[PDB]
Amino acid sequence: AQYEDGKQYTTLEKPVAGAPQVLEFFSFFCPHCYQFEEVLHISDNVKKKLPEGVKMTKYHVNFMGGDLGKDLTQAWAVAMALGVEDKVTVPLFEGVQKTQTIRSASDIRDVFINAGIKGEEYDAAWNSFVVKSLVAQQEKAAADVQLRGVPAMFVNGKYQLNPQGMDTSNMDVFVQQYADTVKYLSEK
Numbered sequence: 001a002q003y004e005d006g007k008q009y010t011t012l013e014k015p016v017a018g019a020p021q022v023l024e025f026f027s028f029f030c031p032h033c034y035q036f037e038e039v040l041h042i043s044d045n046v047k048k049k050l051p052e053g054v055k056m057t058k059y060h061v062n063f064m065g066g067d068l069g070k071d072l073t074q075a076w077a078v079a080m081a082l083g084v085e086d087k088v089t090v091p092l093f094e095g096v097q098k099t100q101t102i103r104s105a106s107d108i109r110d111v112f113i114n115a116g117i118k119g120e121e122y123d124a125a126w127n128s129f130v131v132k133s134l135v136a137q138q139e140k141a142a143a144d145v146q147l148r149g150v151p152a153m154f155v156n157g158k159y160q161l162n163p164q165g166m167d168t169s170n171m172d173v174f175v176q177q178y179a180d181t182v183k184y185l186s187e188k
Contacts, residue, residue: 007165008181012158016144019157020057022046022182025142025150028072028096029064033151037093040175042151049179050186058085059138061150065096071105072096077134078112078125087115155185 005011024043026033036042047056060076062069072092079085091111095102102108112122125131145154153161166177 003181003184007162008177009155009162009185010160012145012154012160014146016154016157019141019144019154021054021156021186022050022056023141023154023157024056024058025061025147025152025154026058027061027064027069027150028092028102029069030150031097034093034097036151037089040171042153042175042178045175045179046153046182049183051183054186057141059141061142061147062139063148064150068102068104071108073138074126074131074135075105075108075112077131077138078122080134081125081128081131082117082121084112084115084117087117088112091115153182155182155188159185159188161185 003009026036043056043058050056060073062073065072075088075092076085079088088111091114092102092108095107095111102111109122109126113119144157145152145160151163155161161178161181163174163178166174166181168174
């Protein structure tokens with residue numbers, strides 16, 4: 001077959017009921033995640049090829065960067081709650097991996113302030129129980145699939161993308177193979 005289990009994807013022996021249709025996991029400490037966001041624009045290109053009736057979810061994980069990794073999962077919860085993901089994703093990645101100006105929760109906060117989220121609004125969100133449950137959701141979705149690595153994409157809680165088994169000579173060709181694989185799995 002052209003798409004083979006164990007090739008462009010793997011199947012979970014322990015499928016996850018009620019899971020989001022397209023579920024993506026990342027860390028701001030994760031070097032391939034940086035590439036996926038700034039150079040490949042994976043999420044955007046997957047979206048462009050998905051049918052509608054399909055929503056896309058993206059969660060941060062704790063297992064990289066210790067204390068600050070956890071602060072980042074809470075910050076991502078804040079971003080989701082305020083709907084400001086598209087405003088903070090790039091400066092968070094760059095502050096962590098490029099300029100290394102993110103060393104504390106306050107430095108994370110600075111990124112939101114400079115992107116125009118209000119001090120009062122950020123702190124209120126940061127401490128909210130809506131954001132607490134949003135952090136719980138991120139952790140639970142990662143736990144459900146026994147996640148030990150990122151970047152990771154899961155389709156309908158039963159297929160896991162396998163980018164190692166795709167061509168990487170050409171970045172554009174890689175992105176289209178990845179996106180087309182998601183579309184295929186989505187129609188499965």
